A paper describes a structure:
[name]/Nei DNA glycosylases are composed of two globular domains, an N-terminal domain rich in beta-structures and a C-terminal domain rich in alpha-structures. Most of them contain an original zinc finger (ZnF) motif (defining a new class of ZnF) comprising a β-hairpin structure with generally four cysteine residues coordinating the Zn2+ ion (type –C-X2(3)-C(H)-X16-18-C-X2-C-). Only the bacterial [name] enzymes can excise 8-oxoG, the major oxidation product of purines. To further our understanding of the TXn mode of action, we solved several crystal structures of [name] bound to 14-mer [[name]:C] (LRC) in the presence of thio-compounds.
The best inhibitor, TX13 (2-trifluoromethyl-6-thiopurine), is a monothio-compound; it was seven times more effective than 2TX, with an IC50appA of 7.5 µM. Using this method, we successfully resolved the structures of LRC with the moderately potent inhibitor 2TX (new crystal structure), high-efficiency inhibitors TX13, TX19, TX20, TX27, low-efficiency inhibitor TX15 and, TX19 in the presence of TCEP. In the absence of reducer and as previously observed with 2TX, all crystal structures showed that 2TX/TXn induced oxidation of the ZnF cysteine residues and the concomitant loss of the Zn2+ ion. With TXn, there was no clear electron density near the sulfur atoms of Cys248 and Cys268. Similar to the 2TX-containing crystal structure, the intramolecular disulfide bridge Cys245-S-S-Cys265 is also formed in the presence of TXn. The strictly conserved residues R260 of the ZnF loop and K57 of the β2-β3 loop of the N-terminal [name] domain are directly involved in the recognition of 2TX/TXn. The guanidinium group of the R260 side chain interacts with the unique sulfur atom of 2TX, TX15, TX20 and TX27, with the sulfur atom at the C8 position of TX19 (with or without TCEP) or with the N1 atom of the purine moiety of TX13. Indeed, fine inspection of the crystal structures of C2 with that of the lesion recognition complex C1 resolved in the presence of 2TX, TX13, TX15, TX19, TX20 and TX27 showed that the 5′-overhanging cytosine of the damage-containing strand recognized by the second molecule (Mol-2) of [name] in C2 clashes with 2TX/TXn bound at the site II.
Author numbering: 1 to 218, 224 to 271
DNA sequence: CTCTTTTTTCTCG
DNA sequence: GCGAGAAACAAAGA
């Protein structure tokens, strides 16, 4: 998932597990608990969930005053709320058992991660990863964005995916954003002009906020409607909305890349 | 049978 | 520092 899907999960979890005391925690794949499963089980068992936050694509469980559980779903992670007698499914790895239900984490590819960190270490955790601003008008400053693009020789799509210019874009929404902003994915950022950068900035905010409103593109968060609004991603060979052309797919920095050549010339 | 396809971080030259 | 390619992993499709 990307930021809109993680935000949709965050909102549903916030509605349902805040206030719940953790009765037990079980793992069939403890290796995804990067800080140590036995330590996490000891610290969090018997604690009450106080809230669920998000930063970029990271989910942040607020569990007691002094701990946060930082969860990343990577490529295929999925959460579901199940009854206590729910049968185990093949790719379930972790479960947080409450008195009247359980939160189960599944991940076919086993990429997703859990990290237990103390409350006063959350901001340093994200500083160390150099995560960029949240994609909102209030947080995403166009002036700094423009300066960073000017000083770099990177291609725009890889640079946006690095999470350092702005947080939360993945392969789907970066393709949608560059189509909407009429920018080639291999455009070198120091060749972007101010009016293009302005449109890119606004387009990032607008696409991600619309995606959040529509519940993401498609367990929790599986009821999104943003997939019906995608213009280029996964649409290889189909006609662009700025009509005439067919959507092409190339490889850029090892990622499948969907774009409309006429609309996105360098 | 092989090869390719679908977030983050590391290795290598 | 850089970028390309690979690594972590599983399943499905060509
Ligand atoms: F593909 C890419 F290599 F450009 C890339 N994509 C994503 S989603 C990403 N997240 C952190 N770093 C990242 N690099």
């Amino acid at each position: 998932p990307e930021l809109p899907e993680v935000e949709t999960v965050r909102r549903e979890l916030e509605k349902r597990i805040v206030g719940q005391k953790i009765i037990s925690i079980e793992a069939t794949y403890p290796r995804m608990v990067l800080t140590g499963f036995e330590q996490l089980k000891k610290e969090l068992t018997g604690k009450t969930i106080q809230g669920i936050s998000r930063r970029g694509k990271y989910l942040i469980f607020e569990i007691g005053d002094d701990f946060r559980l930082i969860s990343h779903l990577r490529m295929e992670g999925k959460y579901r709320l199940a009854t206590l007698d729910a049968p185990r499914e093949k790719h379930d790895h972790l479960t947080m058992k409450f008195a009247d239900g359980q939160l189960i984490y599944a991940d076919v590819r086993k990429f997703g991660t859990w990290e237990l960190i103390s409350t006063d270490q959350v901001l340093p955790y994200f500083l160390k990863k150099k995560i960029g601003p949240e994609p909102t008008y209030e947080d995403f400053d166009e002036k700094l964005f423009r300066e960073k693009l000017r000083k770099s020789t990177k291609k725009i799509k890889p640079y946006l995916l690095e999470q350092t210019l702005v947080a939360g874009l993945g392969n789907i929404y970066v393709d949608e954003v560059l189509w909407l902003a009429k920018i080639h994915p291999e455009k070198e950022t120091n060749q972007l002009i101010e009016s293009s950068i302005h449109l890119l900035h606004d387009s990032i905010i607008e696409i991600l906020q619309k995606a959040i409103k529509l519940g993401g593109s498609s367990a929790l968060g599986s009821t999104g409607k943003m997939q019906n609004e995608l213009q280029v991603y996964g649409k290889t060979g189909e006609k662009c909305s700025r009509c005439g052309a067919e959507i092409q797919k190339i490889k850029v920095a090892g990622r499948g890349t969907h774009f409309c050549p006429v609309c996105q010339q360098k």
